Amino acid sequence: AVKSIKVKLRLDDMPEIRAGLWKLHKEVNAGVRYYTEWLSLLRQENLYRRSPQECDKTAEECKAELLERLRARQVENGHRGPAGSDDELLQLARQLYELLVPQAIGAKGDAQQIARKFLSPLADKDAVRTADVLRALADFGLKPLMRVYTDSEMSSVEWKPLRKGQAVRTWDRDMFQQAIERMMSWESWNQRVGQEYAKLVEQKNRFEQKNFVGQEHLVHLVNQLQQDMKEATGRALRGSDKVFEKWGKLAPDAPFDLYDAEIKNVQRRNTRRFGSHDLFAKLAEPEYQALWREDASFLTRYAVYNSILRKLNHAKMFATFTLPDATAHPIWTRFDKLGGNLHQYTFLFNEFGERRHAIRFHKLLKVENGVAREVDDVTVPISMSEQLDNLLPRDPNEPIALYFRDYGAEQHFTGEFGGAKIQCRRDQLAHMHGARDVYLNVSVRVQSQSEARGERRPPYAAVFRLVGDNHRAFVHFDKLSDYLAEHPDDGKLGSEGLLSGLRVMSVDLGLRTSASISVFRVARKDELKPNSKGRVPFFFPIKGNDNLVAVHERSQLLKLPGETESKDLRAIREERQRTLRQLRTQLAYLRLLVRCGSEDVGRRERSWAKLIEQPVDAANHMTPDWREAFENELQKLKSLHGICSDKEWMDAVYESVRRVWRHMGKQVRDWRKDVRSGERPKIRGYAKDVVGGNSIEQIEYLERQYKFLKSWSFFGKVSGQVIRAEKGSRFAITLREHIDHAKEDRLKKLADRIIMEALGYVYALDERGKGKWVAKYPPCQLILLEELSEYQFNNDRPPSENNQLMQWSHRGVFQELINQAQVHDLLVGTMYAAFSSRFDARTGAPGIRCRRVADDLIPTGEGEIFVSPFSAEEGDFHQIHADLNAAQNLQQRLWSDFDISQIRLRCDWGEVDGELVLIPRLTGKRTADSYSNKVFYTNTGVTYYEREREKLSEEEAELLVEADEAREKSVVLMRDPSGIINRGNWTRQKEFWSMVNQRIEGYLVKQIRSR
RNA sequence: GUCUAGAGGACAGACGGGUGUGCCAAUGGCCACUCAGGUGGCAGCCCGUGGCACGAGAA
């Protein structure tokens, strides 16, 4: 529970110090640059890499450079020999590196310890299995090995004098330790990035091994195709099933025009979604063997290989090396909490007033009149912050003791100041050499109540395993009965009630509603379990106990402010984007006209034909003045179409395109000026319904702007007026920042949102006035997240649910959850979520979603409410909210010890007894436990029956398997627990879901009855 | 009214003081050099009916 509080030093009156701060900074960095340069040098090896990747130093260059330093060193401390063989001296240097960085050889080390131990023999003449290394070193005349930076030429600074036969000032220590700490990190980072590349190469190389199977020629053909295309695949190639089915009728040695026509046929059926015409058109020629000759699958299979192939192409072998620079690569001056050894500081409460604090620096430095000398005790004011107002001091006599305070949470925590770092914006750093803002980053160590009670881990972590970090969750089932009596039920409802009862909250993440949470309490069945106000509660059996069951307390929908829906609201939302929708629709055709330019042929005709007369330029969404202007240049192109020569035509477009490009620039310029600075209504206080943030829609909307501007500009460079070299600077530096902070702010609030609920505090507006957290319900020990991908499973969640934002959001929340959750001891756990939205809890049988993403009723589409068959086969249909039910599923999965082996099975054809069978993918038990030496067979080929007899790489399991799917090689089976859908047998996957559609699609369609 | 999870339920109806980081309709203004976008130089908002969060560090 280290929280970091950054504060701004009002280093305003004293510019004697401000320069000092800056001088410190530059100075520390030089120190670290010194040692760190020694260390990089200090391994006899190894090639050092720096991208502009090019390797800055070999190999020998490090070795040749190091010897000189050493031999120069031997000369500096008078040596009467021996001076080691160069070769053997090198070994010692290597041996020393490793002790200095244990991580280099995959071991462990503490920079605090290794700095404490090693500096004095290294940097000191002592006068005014490591010990082999040091004794060996002095034998060779290399003590001290390295200069001490502050007591040196390099430092332009007058420090406080050195006495008492100590050769190292405190700072020489901090700089050394930083230098080690840094290498230790770098060494483990370089090893990881180097490894990932090989696993990419090795895993990629599998796909080449299994899939292409001695048919090089096809591969070469596409290689040859791609270059044909770039001369003057991915998942563009959307209609290949259909385009390729139809072509089969057509003949090789046949006219192309017949081929082009089929592409046009599928474009209309499948528009919007179609692969580039050009890819297909290119396909049409005598090169159609790639489609033409089985496998047909090959391009679709290949497209994946190209996915992987790029990734290694875009992935790097070595972690690049840069030495710190004050300005380019800053590292920060570091301090220590009062006590402990090195430079220290003291937080002063209310030093200059109430709520006005300051920081006393034992050992700050200051420059006067261009002379930089050291100073002893300095206090610096500090801008008042809300964050500071939170913390408190427990004992004046022992400083560094603070009460860290949370209100609602009803806890008051205890703790201490850790050490600080002084740092500024990285934007300013180039500027500094001048009033540039400076902050102090101060760590804060906070003791959870469990940490305070002296408990090593809280009482209930005994009962819940977690794993993989990526915490997985499993319950210990014996221990629930034990546990509960020791900690039985209570009124206690705050942070207080943590010991008292056992509770789990399950949270599902979704775009419309940020979290849907489910709370279940564990109580004995056949006790008061029947006692319910009014109706009996809903529950789940637990695997361990026949008198223990999980009672559901409440299920809720947690929404960030932006979530609410309304007529007034929807209106405002569509206005916001109206211009942007138009501008993107305008550019699309502006980019189309360019296509008319060709040069390469075929492109010119296809592009030309579509634009002019079919159906027409789109009135529906364009901005009108453009609509006219386009129609103008549109007529103009037509008149001159037969008449003009190829140049007259090509150069007519260029000039024609300029005409519309320029007009847009005013629209763009106009619009950016409005969004960038304009009147808009901005809320005050708390407004229940608000317009965008913190929703995904709002975040999305800001991205979309950025990602348009990147294209408006990019267009100009490709075709149109501009040609310019691209400088390092990226787009929309202001916007990029905004967005990222929106995003930061989103998920931090999303944690606190989820985190408050577990503790069962609700935020009640009245008066609002003041709305304050008031505790409501007893707290929940454990929090259940769901798991993340890759990969995206067929028939679990629409893609609408899956986009970089959702993935990013998932990742962000988990992290902030485990981080936020720490202070008050809440476990954070995850549960496989696959088909947690597809099946019921607890029929529980497969379903579909309805009605909506007159007054509508019952229609079926993805989102937002689940419906399923019950008990069974009409029977009846059971209706449930969609994301509420995913959460409830998570709970069932916990309590019953779910493994996905229960529902799904990946397997491929092999023959065991002169019979073809599906033989499972055994990785990894429970699946292995259940299904080892079981084998599946069919008579139908749709429904399957079971007869008797180290790497998991899940991310890569589906990918190798989806292609196996493309051939007949692999089949997936899925099964209903309920026995409703197929009699409960394993059914091939695709049929299984259709049977599911037909089952509910049918009653619903039928219920309509008469016209 | 409909639906199950029985619940915050989902769906319909002038003076004085401050300015740690950001979000919430929340992406500063002006001029000059090479419609977007950089690069260089110059000079609002809250509090005494405004809300919300916040470990940071490195890439």
Residue A751 phi, psi (nearest 5): -60, -65
- Burial letters for A360-384: b for 16+ Cβ neighbours within 10 Å, e otherwise? bbbbbbbbeeeebebbeebbbbbeb
Nearest to A750 by CA among A692, A787, A797, A696: A696
Query: Is the link from the previous residue into A106 a cis peptide, with omega within 30 of 0?
Result: no
Tokens matching residue A944: 């399957």
Contacts of A222 (CB under 8 A, 6+ apart): A233, A290, A299, A302
Residue pointed to by tokens 């929940």: A780
Distance, angstroms, CA A996 to C1' B31? Answer: 67
Contacts of A415 (CB under 8 A, 6+ apart): A1, A401, A402, A403, A404, A444, A445, A446, A447
- Distance (Å, whole) CA A61 – CA A73: 18
**Which positions of strand B lie within 7 Å of protein CB atoms?**
3-13, 18-29, 34-39, 49-59
Distance, angstroms, CA A855 to C1' B12? Answer: 7
State which residues between 246 and 285 of chain A bring their CB within 7 Å of strand B. none
Distance, angstroms, CA A692 to C1' B26? Answer: 11
Query: Is the link from the previous residue into A802 a cis peptide, with omega within 30 of 0?
Result: no
* A681 strand B contact, CB < 7 Å: yes
- DSSP letter at A569 equals H
Which residues in A32-102 belong to E strands, given as ranges? 48-50, 54-57
- Distance (Å, whole) CA A183 – CA A321: 10
Note whether A993 and A796 are within 8 A (CB).
no
Q: Number of H helices and number of E strands within chain A?
A: 26, 33
Instruction: Return the amino acid letter for A640.
Output: L
Q: Point out the nucleotide closest to A725 (alpha carbon to C1′).
A: B34
- Distance (Å, whole) CA A858 – CA A1002: 12
Distances, alpha carbon A180 to alpha carbons A50, A97, A382, A955, in Å: 20, 10, 32, 35
- Distance (Å, whole) CA A886 – CA A975: 18
Residue pointed to by tokens 């993989």: A468
Contacts of A458 (CB under 8 A, 6+ apart): A450, A498, A781, A825
* A859 strand B contact, CB < 7 Å: no
* A793 strand B contact, CB < 7 Å: no
Q: Is A875 left (phi over 0), alpha (psi -120 to 50) or beta?
A: left
Q: Which residues pair with A392 in a beta bridge?
A: A403
Tokens matching residue A804: 């970089």
Tokens matching residue A139: 């034998």
State which residues between 737 and 756 of chain A bring their CB within 7 Å of strand B. 737-738, 741-742, 744-746, 748-749, 751-752, 755
Contacts of A765 (CB under 8 A, 6+ apart): A686, A688, A771
- DSSP letter at A115 equals H
- Distance (Å, whole) CA A471 – CA A818: 9
Tokens matching residue A61: 């260059």
Q: Would you report the helix, strand and coil content of chain A in percent, each value rounded to 5? A: 40, 20, 40
Nearest to A720 by CA among A775, A654, A671, A804: A654
* A855 strand B contact, CB < 7 Å: yes
State which residues between 876 and 905 of chain A bring their CB within 7 Å of strand B. 878-881, 884-885, 888
- Breaks in chain A after residues (C–N exceeding 2.5 Å): 52, 128, 232, 433, 853, 949
Residue A970 phi, psi (nearest 5): -125, 145
Query: Is the link from the previous residue into A864 a cis peptide, with omega within 30 of 0?
Result: yes
CB-side neighbour CA atoms (13 Å) of A957: 19
- For nucleotide B58, the protein residue with its alpha carbon nearest to C1' is A185
Q: Is A4 left (phi over 0), alpha (psi -120 to 50) or beta?
A: beta
Which residue numbers of A belong to the known binding site for phosphate?
837, 849
- Distance (Å, whole) CA A822 – CA A448: 8
Contacts of A308 (CB under 8 A, 6+ apart): A200, A203, A204, A207, A959
Note the helical H segments in A601-645.
603-613, 624-639
- Distance (Å, whole) CA A393 – CA A402: 4
Tokens matching residue A2: 């280290």
Q: Point out the nucleotide closest to A716 (alpha carbon to C1′).
A: B36
- Distance (Å, whole) CA A111 – CA A101: 9
Tokens matching residue A460: 């209930």
DSSP-assigned states of every residue in A422-461: EE--TTTTTT-------EEEEEEEEE-HHHHTT-SS-TTT
- DSSP letter at A9 equals B
Q: Which residues pair with A516 in a beta bridge?
A: A508, A557
Q: Are strands A336-337 and A344-348 parallel, antiparallel or unpaired?
A: parallel
Rounded to 10 degrees, the C-alpha dihedral A786/A791/A792/A794 comes to -110
> What strands, in cross-sheet order, belong to the sheet with A848-850?
A848-850, A865-870, A876-881
Q: Point out the nucleotide closest to A738 (alpha carbon to C1′).
A: B27
Distances, alpha carbon A94 to alpha carbons A105, A118, A784, A996, in Å: 11, 15, 48, 66
Q: Point out the nucleotide closest to A739 (alpha carbon to C1′).
A: B27
Note the helical H segments in A516-623.
567-595, 603-613
**Helix H or strand E segment including A774:** strand A772-775
- Alpha carbon A938 to its chain's center: 43
- Helices A298-313, A954-966: crossing angle, 10 deg rounding: 150
State which residues between 943 and 1002 of chain A bring their CB within 7 Å of strand B. none
Q: Which own/partner pairs from A107-115 qualify as long-range (CB within 8 Å, at least 24 positions apart)?
A: A109/A180, A109/A184, A111/A177, A111/A178, A111/A180, A111/A181, A111/A184, A112/A177, A114/A177, A114/A180, A115/A173, A115/A176, A115/A177, A115/A180
Note whether A828 and A464 are within 8 A (CB).
no
Contacts of A353 (CB under 8 A, 6+ apart): none
Tokens matching residue A269: 């059926």
Note whether A891 and A897 are within 8 A (CB).
no
Distances, alpha carbon A626 to alpha carbons A365, A587, A621, in Å: 64, 11, 11
Approach to solving:
X-ray
Q: Point out the nucleotide closest to A565 (alpha carbon to C1′).
A: B11
- Burial letters for A776-812: b for 16+ Cβ neighbours within 10 Å, e otherwise? ebbbbbbbbbbbebeeeeebbbeeebbeebbeebbeb
Instruction: Return the amino acid letter for A240.
Output: S
- DSSP letter at A860 equals B
CB atoms near residue A36 (< 10 Å): 25
Residue A261 phi, psi (nearest 5): -60, -40
Tokens matching residue A788: 């993340």
Residue A937 phi, psi (nearest 5): -135, 165
Resolution of this deposited model, Å: 3.1
Q: Point out the nucleotide closest to A382 (alpha carbon to C1′).
A: B20
Distance, angstroms, CA A745 to C1' B52? Answer: 10
State which residues between 622 and 651 of chain A bring their CB within 7 Å of strand B. none
Tokens matching residue A676: 């960038």
Nearest to A271 by CA among A704, A618, A590, A575: A618
Q: Which amino acids of A are annotated catalytic?
A: 508, 786, 883
CB-side neighbour CA atoms (13 Å) of A373: 7
- Alpha carbon A53 to its chain's center: 25
Distance, angstroms, CA A673 to C1' B43? Answer: 21
- Distance (Å, whole) CA A176 – CA A171: 8
What is the sign, positive or negative, of the torsion defined by CA atoms of A318, A324, A329, A330? positive
Distance, angstroms, CA A758 to C1' B33? Answer: 58
Distance, angstroms, CA A561 to C1' B50? Answer: 15
3-state secondary structure of A100: helix
Diameter over CA atoms, chain A: 111
- Burial letters for A909-932: b for 16+ Cβ neighbours within 10 Å, e otherwise? eeeeeeeebbbbbbeeeebeeebe
State which residues between 367 and 396 of chain A bring their CB within 7 Å of strand B. 383-387
CB atoms near residue A30 (< 10 Å): 18
Contacts of A275 (CB under 8 A, 6+ apart): A235, A236, A237, A238, A239, A240
- Distance (Å, whole) CA A766 – CA A233: 59
- Distance (Å, whole) CA A1 – CA A824: 9
> What strands, in cross-sheet order, belong to the sheet with A827-831?
A464-467, A472-475, A827-831, A782-786, A503-509, A515-524, A548-558, A539-541
State which residues between 185 and 204 of chain A bring their CB within 7 Å of strand B. none
| CB-neighbour burial class of residue A728 (10 A; exposed 0-12, middle 13-18, buried 19+) | exposed
* A698 strand B contact, CB < 7 Å: yes
Residue pointed to by tokens 């998920």: A747
- Distance (Å, whole) CA A904 – CA A894: 18
Which residue numbers of A belong to the known binding site?
837, 849
- Distance (Å, whole) CA A558 – CA A516: 6
Tokens matching residue A776: 């409501």
Nearest to A333 by CA among A314, A355, A311, A359: A359
- Say how many residues make up chain A: 1011
- Distance (Å, whole) CA A531 – CA A553: 13
Tokens matching residue A91: 């070994």
Note whether A833 and A890 are within 8 A (CB).
yes
CB-side neighbour CA atoms (13 Å) of A719: 22
- For nucleotide B50, the protein residue with its alpha carbon nearest to C1' is A685
Q: Is A735 left (phi over 0), alpha (psi -120 to 50) or beta?
A: alpha
